[PDB]
Amino acid sequence: EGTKELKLKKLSDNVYQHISYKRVEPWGLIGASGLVVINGTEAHMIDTPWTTQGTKQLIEWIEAKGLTIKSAVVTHFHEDASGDIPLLNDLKIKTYATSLTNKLLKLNQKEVSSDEISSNTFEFIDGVASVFYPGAGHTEDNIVVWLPNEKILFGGCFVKSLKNKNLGYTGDANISEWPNSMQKVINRYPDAKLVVPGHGEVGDVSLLKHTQALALSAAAS
Ligand SMILES: [Zn+2]
Ligand SMILES: [Zn+2]
């Protein structure tokens, strides 16, 4: 049943969803997802849990399964994605972020990743996990992560849930660019079976189309 800070859902033998929540004004309590990807005896995080207690609990759970936590990738500079870079860097767990993410962490006096992604596509786990930068949307720096073996697309905060009626926090968003960036993702992953949004329920490829329509409606206003 998890802890008060962390829950885990199994998506496949090699892929777990890590789940946390926080109250964020003005939307109230919102749930946040990242992933744990298992490759033999090595495990990898996609986003940190939203609390340091949850990240420590997640590391304990990984190690108690007989796995080594090898690396993490953070999908944008906000705290729901990148909040525990300092902890992971302190544990000598490699952290990966794009040059744009590290620009925005540095701008906000936050610790940068240990390892910088300097291309639009990046093999985060060889044959298992691929980073793609689609362009600006939720933030300038947002990336998605594709798991080709399971056809799971981790959308992060660039993808809204199907039931979302708005884009959520747009203080750092590029509403004009978001639909074009989303079309790149739609075109690249027509074979996506599961799309994991940064907040809310997992779903199918319709989450991409929904998010594109939310961004187009936000520009209309
Ligand atoms: Zn964000
Ligand atoms: Zn978010």
Tell me the CA–centroid distance for residue 157 and ligand 2, in Å.
Answer: 5
Strands 7-12 and 15-24: antiparallel
Distance CA 108, CA 83 (A): 12
Tell me the CA–centroid distance for residue 131 and ligand 1, in Å.
Answer: 17
Tell me the CA–centroid distance for residue 66 and ligand 2, in Å.
Answer: 31
**CATH code, domain carrying 163:** 3.60.15.10
Distance CA 25, CA 12 (A): 34
Among residues 32, 62, 50, 7, the alpha carbon closest in space to that of 199 is found at: 32
Among residues 125, 4, 21, the alpha carbon closest in space to that of 73 is found at: 125
Method: X-ray
Distances (CA, A) of 147 to 14, 19, 39, 96, 152: 10, 18, 12, 17, 5
Residues 6+ apart with CB under 8 A from 178: 136, 137, 138, 158, 167, 211, 212, 215
Burial class of residue 170 in the structure, from the number of CB atoms within 10 Å of its CB (0-12 exposed, 13-18 middle, 19+ buried): middle
Distance CA 217, CA 3 (A): 38
Domain extent at residue 129:
1-221
Distance CA 25, CA 168 (A): 10
Find the ligand nearest to 34 CA: 2
Single-letter amino acid, residue 200: G
Find the ligand nearest to 50 CA: 2
How many angstroms is the resolution? 1.7
Among residues 95, 87, 142, 92, the alpha carbon closest in space to that of 115 is found at: 95
Tell me the CA–centroid distance for residue 77 and ligand 1, in Å.
Answer: 7
Overall domain count for the chain: 1
Report yes or no: 19 and 7 within 8 Å, Cβ to Cβ. yes
Tell me the CA–centroid distance for residue 64 and ligand 1, in Å.
Answer: 30
Residues annotated in the binding site for Zn(2+), as ranges? 76, 78, 80, 138, 157, 199
Distance CA 25, CA 41 (A): 40
CA atoms within 13 A on the CB side of 214: 24
Plot region of 40 (φ>0 → left; ψ -120 to 50 → alpha; else → beta): left
Distance CA 78, CA 101 (A): 9
Distance CA 205, CA 41 (A): 30
Report yes or no: 58 and 36 within 8 Å, Cβ to Cβ. yes
Among residues 59, 17, 51, the alpha carbon closest in space to that of 153 is found at: 17
